[PDB]
Amino acid sequence: LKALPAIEGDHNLKNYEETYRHFDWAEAEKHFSWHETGKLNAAYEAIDRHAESFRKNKVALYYKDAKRDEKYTFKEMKEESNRAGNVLRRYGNVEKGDRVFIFMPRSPELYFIMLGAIKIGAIAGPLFEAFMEGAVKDRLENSEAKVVVTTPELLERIPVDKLPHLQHVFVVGGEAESGTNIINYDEAAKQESTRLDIEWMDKKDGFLLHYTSGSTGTPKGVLHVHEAMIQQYQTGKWVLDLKEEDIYWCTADPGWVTGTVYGIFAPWLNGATNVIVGGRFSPESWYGTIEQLGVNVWYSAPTAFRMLMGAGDEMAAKYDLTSLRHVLSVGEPLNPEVIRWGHKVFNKRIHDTWWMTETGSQLICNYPCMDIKPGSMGKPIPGVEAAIVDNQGNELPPYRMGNLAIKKGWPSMMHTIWNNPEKYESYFMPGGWYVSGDSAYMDEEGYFWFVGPFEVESKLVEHPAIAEAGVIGKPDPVRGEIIKAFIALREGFEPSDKLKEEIRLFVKQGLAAHAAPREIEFKDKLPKTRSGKIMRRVLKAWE
Amino acid sequence: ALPAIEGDHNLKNYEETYRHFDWAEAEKHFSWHETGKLNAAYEAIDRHAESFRKNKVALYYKDAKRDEKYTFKEMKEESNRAGNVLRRYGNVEKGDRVFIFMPRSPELYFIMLGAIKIGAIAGPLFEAFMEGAVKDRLENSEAKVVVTTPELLERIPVDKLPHLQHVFVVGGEAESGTNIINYDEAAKQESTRLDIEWMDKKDGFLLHYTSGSTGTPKGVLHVHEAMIQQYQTGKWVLDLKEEDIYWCTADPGWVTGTVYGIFAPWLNGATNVIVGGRFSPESWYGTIEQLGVNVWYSAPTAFRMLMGAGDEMAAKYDLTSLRHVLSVGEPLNPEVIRWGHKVFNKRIHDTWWMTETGSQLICNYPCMDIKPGSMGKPIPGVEAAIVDNQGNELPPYRMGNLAIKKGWPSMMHTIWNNPEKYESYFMPGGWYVSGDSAYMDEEGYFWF
Amino acid sequence: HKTYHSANIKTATGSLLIEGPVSPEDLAGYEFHKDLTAFRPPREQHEALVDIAGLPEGRIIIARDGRTIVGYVTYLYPDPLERWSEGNMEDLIELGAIEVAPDYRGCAVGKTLLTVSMMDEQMENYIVMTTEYYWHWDLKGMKKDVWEYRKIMEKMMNAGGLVWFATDEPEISSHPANCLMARIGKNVSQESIEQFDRLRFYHRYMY
């Protein structure tokens, strides 16, 4: 692994070391209007501050999909969000601290609704359409949300009669029958005015709700505070490298947390240009978007990048991708292979950023102003003390496994787990170390750190005793993952422990040291489809 | 006398700037003062797309069908595409007259910018002319290339024009003949990067023909360096801040829409708004209310026609976003001042210039008192006077002939192939006479 | 329902007859190809061929020389444990083994087989899908690299006009070579198209 050298330019974080040594949140708060005025709101500082600044006539939203190619600026986005907040207050009977839930696919109306809900102080909680009736019903039951905005294709997936606390259901587009609790958005926005009397919030009250599918089977509602906005801006200044001329495209859905803060709030707190691509995924559409829109800053996920590589680099060569300037990946530890492919195609580097729902906004990030280690997330942002702790809360020297913890006190926190202070207090550890539940470790420099089955599979067949096999990666706490293989022996060969080691050594001598299987199991036959294909998802599900 | 309103203007004090201004201070504003390579098209659009205005929306396009918006980068790319098409499929070289005969559309601006970018003299043509006018203008200009729409395709007599090599067609299906090439299937088969033909200070880039009583067409030639003044007034008369939305309602076939709808606002890096289709008061007011136009440069005829609709139409719309509105090339009426002040809560600034002058000379300023019905005062760096036939400077309050001291940046190069008519505009003694009669004021105001 | 179709092709080795949907009793009477062991031993794919031939929706199209089978294409329903069959319903048929014998390859046998398969309208009331991975292919039999191999199947499988589709399968995305080929029928419903769109992208929240 060879560290990617930085590129000289007019960055925003000129020197990371000097800032990390001499950064205070007071100067960061000085960048915000409430430091001088005292009136604070995250949505205000994400939209209205720039809609009143010189960025008023700057493209804020680049919406493209299979049908629409609409464009919105900061003034128009402010007007739309204000209209959504007005309609939510007037029709949804929503007040301070309430819960408003979002059930929409990628569209401008989604961002308008969520920004309007946050502006009036209602805690906004997004949802994903892939959820069945059970998941959405459970989420509204736990949240006791008064309002849920939906789409006609998903109106039938919400049990309005079942939920007692649910009061209003909004539908967007189409022709949905206006029931007792079913109000259509489009007209409600149509006659409603724009100007919104924004309600001003304290430092310690919530503005975002987000439900994560927990290990217990029931989701939990993370409630972030408006103070988190502070951190967002600074991250949107430093890791995201938004200059005044950058076109920023976040590919995450707004139903998730990542598409809610760094696809909505972080870019616009800096007054940048968000890009949203609706419709179905298609590499032609994505590459054409990057080409004709001239995307400079990219924020995507390793899954989408991997699908883009699966498309083929020739399709990328069919378009012009030299307009890219800055690439970032969230949602999963970036693979070095994706990094190499991105550098080869776009001639730009990708930077993995780490955070989760309980975190609020990204903490440990690869930085354009420092050498990039592709396998590392990066270093904590200045003013935030991230480290590695054991089960006792004591700090640990680098280069050793441990539980990643954050020094409690940073502006981007959950104000609560909604109606669950027990899960609150379970999240934090003695000593003021918030625990995120992830495994990570640092190195000497200060960066933080969290296999093709076929080459083993092709190696296996060379034995005269086995006809076919299947290899999966069993998770490991020391080596990350260990190689496990299920072997169906040929006729005349019987399973035993003596021949198990013979497989390991033959793979060891013929392949890499880490390519040797660590666990071997024997089967009469592997799971195979009717045609004869071998699937491994069933194998790892069984394991 | 409508009093000036206190605020942050780009022109702080009129007298201080007037008495201590040199055109070098305006030249250093441009990007060629440190690089040498000067071109009006490059600094109107191409400069901003490499600046912090790249993502700022440059063009709002509205009509009955299309509602797309273009940023500065988008205009730069599309104009480079149009220029590449022009160069490759028309063999137009530096100084070749590229005439454009097409209605108000983003493609029109892209093609105009592309023609000027490759050094070609771009000549706009209004769509209202019938076959003889376009024919004689093309013949006199010896235009190598014309660009048109099929609805007007039959209007140009290609067979009667020996000097017309190629004819470009935009939109629709038009059979690709030997001398007829359709733009669209040539639009998307090249690159979006175009090398800009750099030329010197004295070389034309715009060719505007003005209809006259004689009937012969007269094509004035404006050098690139006229932009030296075009930007400056755009910072003073138009006071284009970074957060203004600019709407120019003059047609782009005419000089005012060509330079104050393309070059003057975009040189300052403003946001131009343009609406297609036939006028309707609801359309214009809805454009204002939706987009929120801050600077509104329109024609006084458009203002009278808007007033004819009544103030109730305006009251139905939100007009508080207006902050700076101006009128083009006609003597503003006091009634129009009063109507604009009650319906927009803002003042209208009447400015004067002609195709021969190239840019605004004597105008009103936001940092300056307005006397209704008056030209205003000359921009600093431009000396104006009231001369007689002999040319002695007439003291104010007496009838005389408007004249401007020669050599100002926006001076014309010549009338195309008519040096005698070019010299007929000038009176010995360093004075250019625009043919308009006016008088001055003790403070410096100018009145018809 | 099934309508029988057939066609003939000519080459240096002789005439190959491509029987379309064929009745299982006749396949039970053929002689297998010893060289064609890309997926299973002959016994196992014989059992598969007869089973899918017996299914009401499963179909088999065979290109053969005389009484010996040399290539087959299956239209079996997706594996019940496989994620593509979570609905476990209708109008979803998974294409499986399409490969042909090694030394008959390069004779336009596969493209002719697929075209003879696919001209039927009952191929077009249902959409067709298949999932291809690098470890299922002859790595050393033909001795050319990865991306050219993918391109040559894209060409040879365009005979039926099949367009390439992207999916988030953890198995598919482990290597950019492994992908998903499919066709969308002209007699299928739009609701089926939306259902397949949902099925293809399971965890869409990441992108």
Author numbering:
A (entry chain B): 3 to 452, 467 to 559
B (entry chain A): 5 to 452
C (entry chain C): 4 to 210
Question: What do the paper's sentences say?
Answer:
Acetyl-CoA synthetase (Acs) generates acetyl-coenzyme A (Ac-CoA) but its excessive activity can deplete ATP and lead to a growth arrest. To prevent this, Acs is regulated through Ac-CoA-dependent feedback inhibition executed by Ac-CoA-dependent acetyltransferases such as AcuA in Bacillus subtilis. Acs enzymes consists of two consecutively operating modules, a C-terminal domain (CTD) catalyzing the first and a N-terminal domain (NTD) for the second reaction step.
A second major class of particles showed the AcsA homodimer bound to AcuA. In these particles, the CTD of the AcsA subunit of the homodimer bound to AcuA was resolved, while the CTD of the non-AcuA-bound AcsA subunit in the homodimer remained unresolved. Our structure clearly demonstrates that AcuA restricts the conformational flexibility of the CTD, thereby enforcing a so far unreported conformation of the NTD and CTD of AcsA. A detailed analysis revealed that the main chains of AcuA_M209 and Y208 form hydrogen bonds with AcsA_D255, while the main chain of AcuA_Y210 forms a hydrogen bond with AcsA_R108. Additionally, a loop containing the catalytic residue K549 within the CTD of AcsA aligns with the active site of AcuA. The cryo-EM structure of the complex shows that the very C-terminus of AcuA inserts into the CoA-binding site of the NTD of AcsA.
